[PDB]
């Protein structure tokens, strides 16, 4: 938390941003067209601000540092002109200190890192002071010359567009035109209303986005060559108004890339004791459940409100896994509201629970002729448990009038006991492992989904089709059109 403030505070520095800032609204290929759109753009011939944080001051001195947080109204346009890698990344959040999950974007000379976590930023970002449980991560390639970025956040989605154009004429924004191609479409779902830059004389221009109605000119290959802004002059307003200057099926879906790590919980060796059950959170994966039921190694695969051979086409937001080891004839106690003490002193289920239950046999794995003695379960407590509560406190349970002051004696007892496992027993005392799956979803983009299919494209027989959701009917054939290498379909 170094203190390097300088306190100069010279606000007024403004420059004209003109014919600058037009991106590709959506992923389509159109050729020789004049399209019209109503969306968030930067007004032509506007005032952008010229921050000059680090500066060589007058003789005998070079010190100023005034890069503050700025309002994030609807989106932002950020332009930089640096001869080196001096600026590095950004921080986004509401209050930036353990109240809303903040977002960090940084990068090396060779790698880039995006992370959403509940930070506690210090003053004048060695950048933060602590980190905790958090949600998302990502790695890819890192992002004179001029570099321009456009940041938008809508509907639980963060979108970043970028462009690199080399100039050497002057420090001001050049006259001319260049569109900005799409780069990143992260799902996060947090809310943002302030931001702050970080760098390691520095100058950058910042401007704000507003809703307008643009007219765009697509040329022969599909690159926005020119644009005109309505509502600027009567002339351009007239420019706007005049608009001038079956046999079978086919299903085809992408590869199956990101398998989901169920090979850990169902294969590990040191699961738990009954009162210290773990909790594993799984997200951002493609999970196939068909491999599980057919495994034939399970002897209890009950379910609640899922209908197993129906779920494979559903997407949730969070999936949790719990795991532990209990004695034999208590697998009939992990269910909706019940009581056999292991449902109301160690583990408790909600009434409207939607999940699945697993139970192996483990006779030949945890056996010990002497006795395993390593698994503990609770026996004494004054009050029952609300759903999903852990208690690892070994306090001495009073059972009499006199306070014993933490002395295990005549009326103060120990609240734990050990399972005596051994191989000469039978079913009903042998150890059964248990894994419980729970599903949840709320107001957030889905991440966990089932695996989709593909059906051996046929082109010369005029049939149905479903290309990644663009259903239709017709005859298919190969073309010579070259898209841009991000566009999907062309209308």
């Amino acid at each position, epitope marked *: 938390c170094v203190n390097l403030t300088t306190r100069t505070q010279l606000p007024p520095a403004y420059t004209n941003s003109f014919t600058r800032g037009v991106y590709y609204p959506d992923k389509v290929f159109r050729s020789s067209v004049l399209h019209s759109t109503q969306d968030l753009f930067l007004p032509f011939f506007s005032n952008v601000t010229w921050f000059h944080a680090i500066h060589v001051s007058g003789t005998n001195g070079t010190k100023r540092f005034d890069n503050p947080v700025l309002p994030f109204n609807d989106g932002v346009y950020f332009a930089s002109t640096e001869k080196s890698n001096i600026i590095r990344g950004w921080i986004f959040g509401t209050t930036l200190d353990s109240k809303t999950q903040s977002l960090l974007i940084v990068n090396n000379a060779t790698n880039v890192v995006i992370k959403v976590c509940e930070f506690q930023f210090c003053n004048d970002p060695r950048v933060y002071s602590s980190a905790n449980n958090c949600t998302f991560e990502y790695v890819s390639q890192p992002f004179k010359n001029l570099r321009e970025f456009v940041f938008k956040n809508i509907d639980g989605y963060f979108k970043i567009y970028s462009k690199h154009t080399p100039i050497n004429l002057v420090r001001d924004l050049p006259q001319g035109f260049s569109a900005l191609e799409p780069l990143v479409d992260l799902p996060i779902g947090i809310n943002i209303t302030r931001f702050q830059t970080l760098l390691a004389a520095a100058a950058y221009y910042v401007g704000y986005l507003q809703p307008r109605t643009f007219l765009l000119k697509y040329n022969e290959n599909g690159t926005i060559t020119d644009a005109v802004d309505c509502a600027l002059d009567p002339l351009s307003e007239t420019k706007c108004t005049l608009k001038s200057f079956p046999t079978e099926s086919i299903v085809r879906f992408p590869n199956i890339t990101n398998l989901c790590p169920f090979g850990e919980v169902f294969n590990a060796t040191r699961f738990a004791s009954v009162y210290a059950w773990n909790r594993k959170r799984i997200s951002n994966c493609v999970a196939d459940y068909s491999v599980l039921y057919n495994s034939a190694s399970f002897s209890t695969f009950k379910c609640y409100g899922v209908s197993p051979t129906k779920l494979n086409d559903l997407c949730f937001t969070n999936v949790y896994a719990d795991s532990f080891v209990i004695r034999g004839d208590e697998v009939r106690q992990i269910a909706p509201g019940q009581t056999g003490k292991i449902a109301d002193y160690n583990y408790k289920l909600p009434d409207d629970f939607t999940g699945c239950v697993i139970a192996w046999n483990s006779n030949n794995l945890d056996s010990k002729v*002497g*006795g395993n*003695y390593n698994y503990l379960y609770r*026996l004494f407590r004054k009050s029952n448990l609300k759903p999903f509560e852990r208690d690892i406190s070994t306090e001495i349970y009073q059972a009499g009038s006199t306070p014993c002051n933490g002395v*295990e*004696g*005549f009326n103060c*007892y*120990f609240p*734990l*006991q*050990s399972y*005596g496992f051994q191989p000469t027993n039978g079913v009903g005392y042998q150890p059964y492992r248990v894994v419980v799956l729970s599903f949840e979803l709320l107001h957030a983009p889905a991440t966990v989904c089932g695996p989709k299919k593909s059906t051996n494209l046929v082109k010369n027989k005029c049939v149905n089709f479903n290309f990644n959701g663009l259903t239709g009917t017709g005859v298919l054939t190969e073309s010579n059109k070259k898209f841009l290498p991000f566009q999907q379909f062309g209308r």
Partner: antibody
Amino acid sequence: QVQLVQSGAEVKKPGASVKVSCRASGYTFTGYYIHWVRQAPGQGLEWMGWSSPISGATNYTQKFQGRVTLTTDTSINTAYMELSRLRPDDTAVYYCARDIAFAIVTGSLDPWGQGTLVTVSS
Amino acid sequence: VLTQPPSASGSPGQSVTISCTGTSNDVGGYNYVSWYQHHPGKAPKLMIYEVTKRPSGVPDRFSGSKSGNTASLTVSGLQAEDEADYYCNSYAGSNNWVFGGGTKLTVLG
């Protein structure tokens, strides 16, 4: 079945320490407190102290507070008791007794072992 | 501590009473009195535990009760195999317990 086996005899000298072992076969070891008892030759029985095999908490009698220790090795099913710095008049016999409760101190001592004979003289 | 009569006699067939006199907060405080039978050399064996409750193996001929600050045993029926002495135990207090002196049982057989 439920059996306790105690170690062999022992002869020591004044100013020395002695340690005896009691081994449990049958039941599940954790879950029953264990008491020690001493019988003098010709006198009456007396109480020594109790220990627990699950936590480790232990307690003695009022007069035997200084020179007595006692532990439990919950891996090979055994419990040890050591009395140090024996006067020659402490010739007696020591018994290990198991309680019959379940994680409670109750006091019905059954079953008892066999009994060690300890002899200390100059 | 506490004590009881150190002598007792008996004859086959009939019944005798053997006592154990309690103190203020030795026997009359809490209900944990138990009595044992001690052959000459072997280990003891439970004859009665916690008030008058009895394990399986000991016949019903044994009994007991607690008259405030006094415990007792009565054997209505004698098979001459019971000649050794007997001991009475109770929760003395503060996780420390006390036994009794013992009472030799004499038969005329």
